[PDB]
Design a protein around this ligand. Structure first.
Ligand code: MG
Lengths: 80, 129, 156, 87, 82, 205
RNA sequence: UUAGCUAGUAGGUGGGGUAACGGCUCACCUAGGCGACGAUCCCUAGCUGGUCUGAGAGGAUGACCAGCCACACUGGAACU
RNA sequence: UACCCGCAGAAGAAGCACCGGCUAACUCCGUGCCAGCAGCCGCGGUAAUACGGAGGGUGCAAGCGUUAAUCGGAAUUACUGGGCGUAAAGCGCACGCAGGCGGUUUGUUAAGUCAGAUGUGAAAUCCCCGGGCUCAACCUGGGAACUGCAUCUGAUACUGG
C-alpha cells in the first residue's frame, strides 16, 4: 500500500545511517535503449543492524538529517 | 557466440530462399515453434516438423511460388542489443499491411492485425514480407 | 499514346591521336499512362539524332508495372549503383512529389499522387534505374494473395 | 555507430562559425576610415580594386571593398559596412 | 483572495470579457483561478452573450467568494431573464 | 495593389485566351495572338520545366487578377482542407465574389465586375459587400442595388453573358438582376486548361 | 588539455534555535561524506508553457502573453 | 466614433529588383583583364545576352532589394537515417576488470513490458468543428490534443528476479 522502494545497502559505517543505492531502469529518450541507472540514498536505519551488501526496503519519511530523509521498513536476504 | 536463436532462425530462412532449398532445419525452441506456427497459419511456409527428444530440431518446408520464392523479405525488429516494445496503436503495417509483423504480447504470439483486434500491444519480433 | 520525355542532354568525349571526338548522349523514357514504362539511353554524333536512338531503345524492352488507381500500392525503396531512392504512395489530389529524372519517369508511368525521395547519387542515369527497380518488384495485393495462397479479405 | 557507443557518447553535431565576425551578429556596423587605397586581385582577374582599411566601432581594423565606380572617400570618414566577401 | 471580475480579452475598441474566478491580488493577463464563463457587451442578436456555470459559482460563494459589481448585476439579470 | 497595364499583352505572354475584354471586336484583330510582346517575342524557346509551372500559375492568377501573397493564402487554405487540393483551390477561386459577378455576367469583364463591388453597387443577401475578394457561401443571393441598376454597362454585359456558356451552379435571374449560388462547382464545371497536378507541385518544392 | 573533492564536512547524542522538520545552531562522539552514472573546477545562462523550422524525427529558440524566479546606486544588516 | 447621404472629376494616388547558366525572362550601343561585375560557376585582354547605357522583357508590389540571424535542403554526426580492402576511418597484437550481452527446459515472481481505470498534465497557443466583426487579419464558443507522470486493477508471451 505505501509508496515503498528497495535497493542495495552500500554503506553501514556511520551510526544510525545507511547508504542505499537504487536501480532505476529507464529508456533513453532518443536511442531507446533501456539503461540501468543508479540512485543512491542516505537511509536512516536504527540499531546499525544492517549488514553491508544487502537488499533493504525503504520508505520516505520526514527529514532526519542534513543529507538524510529516508527510513527503512524491513530487510530481505541479509546474508552474503 | 550464440547471442540469439531467433536471428539465427530468420537468417536460415532468409538464406534458404535464395539457396532454393526445400527444407531448412535447426534445433528447435519453445519460442521458435510459437513463431513457426504463425507463418504456416499466415501462409509463408508450407510445413514445419518439430522432432527430436534429447534436443528438439525444427525442420521447415519453404513455400515457393511460380518457381521463385514467397518470402520476399524477412527482418528482425527487436534485436538482442535493442528491444522493441510498442503499444497497440503503434503496431506497424508491413508493406502497407500486405506483409505481416510478428508481435509477442501477453496473449502469446500472433500477428499485428490480430493484435489490433485483440486491442493490446507488446514486443514486436520481426517483419515478414 | 506512349508519351515520351527526354531526360539528359550531354556531351561526352573520346580522345584520339588527332584530338577529342565529342559525342552527344541522351537519356529518354517512354510510357503509356498505364503501368508500362521504358527508359532509353542513346548516343550519336548529334543532339537530334541520338534522341531517336534513345527513343527506339525505350520503345522496345518495356516493363509491366502494377499500379493502383492513381498512385502506388505501398511504399518501397530503390537502388542501382549507389543511388538509394525511396518512394511512397500518397493521397488523392497532391501531384507527383519528386525531383530530377524521377518526376519524368513517374509521369509517363501514369501515377498521379506520390511521395518520393532520392538518397545518395543523383546521377540521372543510375537514379532512374533505381526508380524502375522499385516499381518493378512492387506487387499487387492480388498476387500476394495468390503467392501466399489466400484472398484479399484473407489479407485485408 | 553501436548504440552503446552512442549511449556513452552522443553525436557531436559540428559547430559552424561566421565568416563575418567583426559585425558580431549585427546587420550593419559604423566604421572609421584609416587608409584608402587600391589592391590588385588574384590571378584570373586583373584590376585595381578600390578598397579601404577601416577602424570599426569595436576597435577592429578591417578591410572592406568599395563598390561601384568612383567615390568621394577620405581617411577619417564615417562609413557603414554590410558584409559579403570579395572572391 | 478569490475574486470574480471582468477580464478584457479582445481587440481595441471592441471589448470581450472572460468573467472568471480569479484572485483579487493578481491581474488580467496573469492569474485567474477558474474559468466560469464569459461576457460580451457587444453581444449581438442570434447569439448568447452571457454563458455562466451558475452552480459552481454557488459552490465558491459557499466557500466565501467575492462578487464584483457587474458580476452581481449580470448574474441577477440572467436570473431576471432566465 | 492591382494590375493596370495592357491586358492583351498578358494574353500574348501566356498565348491562350484570358477573356480580358468583352470579345465584341475579335481578339486576333487586336493583337498578334501568337507572338510574345516586344523584340524577342516571335522565337519560341525550348521552354523549361520551371517556366511552364510558372506560366501555369501565372495564368491562373492573371485569370482572376490575384496577386501572389493573397493567392498563396488560398494555397494555404486549400492545403489545410481535405481531398484534392487543386479542386479545393478552384472552389476558393470560384468562391470569390468578384468572380461570381462575372460568372453571372453582370460585369462584362472581371475588372468590370470588380469596380461595381468596389463602387458598392452590389447587395449580397440584401447587404452591401465592398470587398471584391469576399468568399461566397452557398445558397446566397447577389443582387444589384437600385442606385446603379440603371448603368448601361450592366445590361450590355447581360447580352455578353448570353454569348458565353451559361454556368450550371448558378441560379441566375435577369429581370431583377440577381442570382443564387446553388452549390459549389466541380473541376469539370470549369475549363480543362488548368492543371491540378502542376500548381500544387509549384508551391510544394 | 577540469580527477580527485569535503572537517560542521558526513553521521550520531545532547543542548539551543525557528511557524515548522533538520549542523538550523552549539557541544560531544564517530570518521565518515562525495566522485569516472563527471564529483570538483572553468566558461556561458533567468526557467517553463511556448515560439521558429522540419514530412516526421529532430534542431534551434525564450521579445511580445502567461507560470515561476531573481534584482532595485553598490555593499551590508536588521527592523516593522 | 461605427455607419448613412451629398459633392466633384478620371480625378489626388506605383515602384523596386532582375534577364550568362544555376532560375522565369535579349537585343542594341558604349567599354577594351581598363572601368568593373560577382550567391556559386565565373565574365571584361575591341564584336561582352554576365561591365555601363538604351530598348524590350521577367518577377513582385505599397513596397522592392541587400545585409544580419535560425532551421530546411544536409542522410553533411546518418535514433528515425551513414561508413571504415584501396575515396577520411579497425587500436601492432594478446590479456582482462567494471561494462554491455547472453544456450536449452520447468515452476515461481510480475520488475520491465502490455491493457484498463483514477488523478494531474493552468490558461493561452496549435489542431478540429462553430460563431462574431461587410470579409480577411483578428476576436471567440465547443471539441480534440497536451505525446507525460503518479496511483489502482489486471495480463503472462518475451526480457528480467
Ligand atoms: Mg484537397
Amino acid at each position: 500500500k505505501i509508496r515503498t522502494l528497495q535497493g542495495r545497502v552500500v554503506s553501514d559505517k556511520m551510526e544510525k545511517s545507511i547508504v542505499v543505492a537504487i536501480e532505476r531502469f529507464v529508456k533513453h529518450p532518443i536511442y531507446g535503449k533501456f539503461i540501468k541507472r543508479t540512485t543512491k540514498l542516505h537511509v536512516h536505519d536504527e540499531n546499525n543492524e544492517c549488514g553491508i551488501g544487502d537488499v533493504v526496503e525503504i520508505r520516505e519519511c520526514r527529514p532526519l538529517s542534513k543529507t538524510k530523509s529516508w527510513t527503512l521498513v524491513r530487510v530481505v536476504e541479509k546474508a552474503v | 557466440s550464440m547471442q540469439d536463436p531467433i536471428a539465427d532462425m530468420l537468417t536460415r530462412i532468409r538464406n534458404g530462399q535464395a539457396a532454393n532449398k526445400a527444407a531448412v532445419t535447426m534445433p528447435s525452441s519453445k519460442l521458435k515453434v510459437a513463431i513457426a506456427n504463425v507463418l504456416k497459419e499466415e501462409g509463408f511456409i508450407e510445413d514445419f516438423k518439430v522432432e527430436g527428444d534429447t534436443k528438439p530440431e525444427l525442420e521447415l518446408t519453404l513455400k515457393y511460388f511460380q518457381g521463385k520464392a514467397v518470402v520476399e523479405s524477412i527482418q528482425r525488429v527487436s534485436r538482442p542489443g535493442l528491444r522493441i516494445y510498442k503499444r497497440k496503436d503503434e503496431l506497424p503495417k508491413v508493406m502497407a499491411g500486405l506483409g505481416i509483423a510478428v508481435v509477442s504480447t501477453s496473449k502469446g504470439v500472433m500477428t499485428d492485425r490480430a493484435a489490433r483486434q485483440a486491442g493490446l500491444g507488446g514486443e514486436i519480433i520481426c517483419y515478414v514480407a | 499514346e506512349l508519351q515520351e520525355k527526354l531526360i539528359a542532354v550531354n556531351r561526352v568525349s573520346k580522345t584520339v591521336k588527332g584530338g577529342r571526338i565529342f559525342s552527344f548522349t541522351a537519356l529518354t523514357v517512354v510510357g503509356d499512362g498505364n503501368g508500362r514504362v521504358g527508359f532509353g539511353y542513346g548516343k550519336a554524333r548529334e543532339v537530334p539524332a541520338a534522341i531517336q536512338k534513345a527513343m527506339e531503345k525505350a520503345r522496345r524492352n518495356m516493363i509491366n508495372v502494377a499500379l493502383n488507381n492513381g498512385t502506388l500500392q505501398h511504399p518501397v525503396k530503390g537502388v542501382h549503383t549507389g543511388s538509394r531512392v525511396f518512394m511512397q504512395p500518397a493521397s488523392e489530389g497532391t501531384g507527383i512529389i519528386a525531383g530530377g529524372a524521377m518526376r519524368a519517369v513517374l509521369e509517363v508511368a501514369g501515377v498521379h499522387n506520390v511521395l518520393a525521395k532520392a538518397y545518395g547519387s543523383t546521377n540521372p542515369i543510375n537514379v532512374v534505374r533505381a526508380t524502375i527497380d522499385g516499381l518493378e518488384n512492387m506487387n499487387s495485393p492480388e498476387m500476394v494473395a495468390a503467392k501466399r495462397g489466400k484472398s484479399v479479405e484473407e489479407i485485408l | 555507430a553501436t548504440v552503446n557507443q552512442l549511449v556513452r557518447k552522443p553525436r557531436a553535431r559540428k559547430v559552424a562559425k561566421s565568416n563575418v565576425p567583426a559585425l558580431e551578429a549585427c546587420p550593419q556596423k559604423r566604421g572609421v576610415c584609416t587608409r584608402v587605397y587600391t589592391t590588385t586581385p588574384k590571378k584570373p582577374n586583373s584590376a585595381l580594386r578600390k578598397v579601404c582599411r577601416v577602424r570599426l566601432t569595436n576597435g577592429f581594423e578591417v578591410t572592406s571593398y568599395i563598390g561601384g565606380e568612383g567615390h568621394n572617400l577620405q581617411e577619417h570618414s564615417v562609413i557603414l559596412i554590410r558584409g559579403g566577401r570579395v572572391k | 483572495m478569490v475574486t470574480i471580475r471582468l477580464a478584457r480579452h479582445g481587440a481595441k475598441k471592441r471589448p470581450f470579457y472572460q468573467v472568471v474566478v480569479a484572485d483579487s491580488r493578481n491581474a488580467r493577463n496573469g492569474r485567474f483561478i477558474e474559468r466560469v464563463g464569459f461576457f460580451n457587451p457587444i453581444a449581438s442578436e442570434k447569439e448568447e452573450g452571457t454563458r455562466l456555470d451558475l452552480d459552481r459559482i454557488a459552490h465558491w460563494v459557499g466557500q466565501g467568494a467575492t462578487i464584483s459589481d457587474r458580476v452581481a448585476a449580470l448574474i441577477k439579470e440572467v436570473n431576471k431573464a432566465a | 495593389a492591382r494590375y493596370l497595364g495592357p491586358k492583351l499583352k498578358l494574353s500574348r505572354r501566356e498565348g491562350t485566351d484570358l477573356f480580358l475584354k468583352s470579345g465584341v471586336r475579335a481578339i486576333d484583330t487586336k493583337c498578334k495572338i501568337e507572338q510574345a510582346p516586344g523584340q524577342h517575342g516571335a522565337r519560341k524557346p525550348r521552354l523549361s520545366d520551371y517556366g511552364v509551372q510558372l506560366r501555369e500559375k501565372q495564368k491562373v492568377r492573371r485569370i482572376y487578377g490575384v496577386l501572389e501573397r493573397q493567392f498563396r493564402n488560398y494555397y494555404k487554405e486549400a492545403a489545410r482542407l481535405k481531398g484534392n487540393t487543386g479542386e479545393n483551390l478552384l472552389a476558393l477561386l470560384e468562391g470569390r465574389l468578384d468572380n461570381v459577378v462575372y460568372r453571372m455576367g453582370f460585369g462584362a469583364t472581371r475588372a468590370e465586375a470588380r469596380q461595381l463591388v468596389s463602387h458598392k453597387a452590389i447587395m449580397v443577401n440584401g447587404r452591401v459587400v465592398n470587398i471584391a475578394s469576399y468568399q461566397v457561401s452557398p445558397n446566397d443571393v447577389v443582387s444589384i442595388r437600385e442606385k446603379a441598376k440603371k448603368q448601361s454597362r450592366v445590361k450590355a454585359a447581360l447580352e455578353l453573358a448570353e454569348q458565353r456558356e451559361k454556368p450550371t451552379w448558378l441560379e441566375v435571374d435577369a429581370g431583377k438582376m440577381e442570382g443564387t449560388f446553388k452549390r459549389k462547382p466541380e473541376r469539370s464545371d470549369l475549363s480543362a486548361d488548368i492543371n491540378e497536378h502542376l500548381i500544387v507541385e509549384l508551391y510544394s518544392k
